[PDB]
């Protein structure tokens, strides 16, 4: 036999495994480390770059760049490092042995497809490849065929209504609000309590604060008033050097920015409004199904209470006749990869691959024509 490689590019993480695995074997941040200083000792290991968890371990000494910002690959030379490290070091598998499946956000600049393909065929010499829209895969992961999928990662937020196997492309909406920009806002607002994070490596300390402490308010303003009235919401966390920091009503204020992006200064409304407004773009006939099948996907959705808040706010905005239901698989951060596993393991899918012969004739333009 041969069993396909399935590999997901976020902005913050990379997830990869073989098709038919239950969950990816490799997860590590897509982060590239360079030194900032003179090497003191001759005979030390003199490394020119670090990748992923290595760069996590050494981050104090280093500059942590991200190759991907807003789902766009920004500098292809370090991206090549990310993939090379994935295939040889994490999976211990040569790409020439296995076809690969690669994951993309729906409106990203078209050139990203050609370049991402070209690196698989020329650099790794992958046998065959396909590229999938994240929201599509989330439906395979959740186990249904009609959904409006909301997904939000480190790089991008987007919605794609899918009805009974048919995507409805005009409905698609995308916001560049993401786990990264909640993090930068978290730095700005942390400054007000007196705790000040400047460097790239400090951002990841902030991000661990955000992941552990934050939560979503069910009434933002009533909890603001309560926390101003009472300490109990305040909670406290330990810097890597052992200093405690203690954090208050502000810890919810970052999740709130997704609903009220006017804080950061966006034009575009909160994800609840865009969700309803995207349903409005669809035909009336489908809408009853989508109001039940709200699917949340990608790690940014993991904030406790985001489901209850979303349901509450969209219910008030919905036509009262329709019930609203929301579905939040507890692993949903993985769900884009779980979906890409299901989809890559199907027998019917096999003919979909862009094969090395076909690319070699067609030129990387082929991705636009065949793949979508």
């Amino acid at each position: 036999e041969t069993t396909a490689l399935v590999c997901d590019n976020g902005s913050g993480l990379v997830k990869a495994g073989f098709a038919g695995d239950d969950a990816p074997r490799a997860v590590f941040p897509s982060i590239v480390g360079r030194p900032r200083h003179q090497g003191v000792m001759v005979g030390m290991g003199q490394k020119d770059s670090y990748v992923g968890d290595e760069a996590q371990s050494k981050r104090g000494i280093l500059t942590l760049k991200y190759p991907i910002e807003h789902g766009i690959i920004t500098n292809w030379d370090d991206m090549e490092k990310i993939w090379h490290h994935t295939f040889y070091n994490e999976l211990r598998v040569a790409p020439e042995e296995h076809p690969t499946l690669l994951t993309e956000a729906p409106l990203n600049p078209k050139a990203n497809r050609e370049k991402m393909t070209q690196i698989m065929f020329e650099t790794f010499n992958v046998p065959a490849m396909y590229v999938a829209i994240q929201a599509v895969l989330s439906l395979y992961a959740s186990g249904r065929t009609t959904g409006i999928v909301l997904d939000s990662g480190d790089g991008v937020t987007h919605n794609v209504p899918i009805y009974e196997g048919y995507a409805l492309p005009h409905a698609i909406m995308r916001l560049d609000l993401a786990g990264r920009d909640l993090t930068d806002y978290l730095m700005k607002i942390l400054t007000e309590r007196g705790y000040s994070f400047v460097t790239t490596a400090e951002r990841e300390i902030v991000r661990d604060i955000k992941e552990k402490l934050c939560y979503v308010a069910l009434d933002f303003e009533n909890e603001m008033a309560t926390a101003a009235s009472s300490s109990s919401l305040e909670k406290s966390y330990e810097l890597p050097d052992g200093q405690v920091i203690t954090i208050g009503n502000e810890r919810f204020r970052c999740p709130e920015t997704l609903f009220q992006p006017s804080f950061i200064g966006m034009e575009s409304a909160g994800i609840h409004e865009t969700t309803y407004n995207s349903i409005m773009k669809c035909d009336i006939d489908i809408r009853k199904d989508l109001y039940a099948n709200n699917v949340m996907s990608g790690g940014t959705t993991m904030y406790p209470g985001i489901a209850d808040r979303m349901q509450k706010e969209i219910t008030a905005l919905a036509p009262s006749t329709m019930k609203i239901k929301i579905i939040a698989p507890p692993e949903r951060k993985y769900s884009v990869w779980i979906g890409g596993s299901i989809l890559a393991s199907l027998s019917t899918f096999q003919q979909m691959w862009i094969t090395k012969q076909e690319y070699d004739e067609a030129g990387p333009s082929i991705v636009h024509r065949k793949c979508f």
């Binding site: 910002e69 807003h70 789902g71 766009i72 920004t74 600049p109 560049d176």
Partner: peptide, 7 residues
């Protein structure tokens, strides 16, 4: 990106 945003 190339315009409306930094990437």
């Amino acid at each position: 990106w190339x315009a409306x945003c930094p990437a």
